[PDB]
Amino acid sequence: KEVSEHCSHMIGNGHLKVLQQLIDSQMETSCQIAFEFVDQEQLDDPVCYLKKAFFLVQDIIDETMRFKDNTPNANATERLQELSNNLNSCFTKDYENKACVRTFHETPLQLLEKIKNFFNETKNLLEKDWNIFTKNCNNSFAKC
């Protein structure tokens, strides 16, 4: 059914810039961190891909993007943490729950890229059709 129309403009360019500045400041290291994310090999559908990613992105924002309190980046994460909560109103639940997901071991920088790409693709789609993520993904998911 219908969802909030606000979802159409939930994600602004201010959110993506804040996200890039955050990325830019990060130091390139060999150290890899472990995190759960969507396995593309088993889930291609662009809509259902982002639909499944949104919930993993949320966890990552809360439980991995840690910055020293009151720093410019910490504030970025504040804004992103809030944005993520508002977006709950734009993603309907699908019947499953741990399939389509794999363990990723990659650089913190390569991770912050995935989050970026998510908020970007998600932004575009929502502009085009702010009911897009009400899609039924039971099958797409089940094909994993």
| 3 state DSSP class of 4 | coil
Residue span 113-142 as binding mask against Ca ion, x where in contact by CB under 5 A, dash where not: -----------------------x-xx---
H or E, element range at 2: none
The contacts of residue 88 (CB under 8 Å, 6+ apart) are none
Q: Which is nearer to a second copy, 7 or 65 (CB)?
A: 65
Quote the CA–CA distance of 83 and 104 in Å, as a whole number.
24
Partner in contact with 28, chosen from a second copy, Ca ion, none, beta carbon below 5 to 8 Å by kind = a second copy
- How near is the Cβ of 126 to Ca ion at its closest, in Å? 11
Q: Quick one: 76 exposed, middle or buried, by C-beta within 10 A (0-12, 13-18, 19+)?
A: buried
Residues 17-76 that bind Ca ion (CB under 5 A): none
When asked if residue 9 is in the footprint of Ca ion (CB under 5 A), the reply is yes
Partner in contact with 73, chosen from Ca ion, a second copy, none, beta carbon below 5 to 8 Å by kind = a second copy
Q: Which is nearer to a second copy, 26 or 85 (CB)?
A: 26
- How near is the Cβ of 60 to a second copy at its closest, in Å? 11
**Residues in touch with a second copy (CB under 8 A):** 22, 24-33, 64-68, 71-73, 107-108, 112
Structure tokens at 45: 């559908």
Closest-CA residue to 10 (of 106, 119, 100): 119
Q: Are 138 and 61 in contact (CB under 8 A)?
A: no
Residues 86-105 that bind Ca ion (CB under 5 A): 103
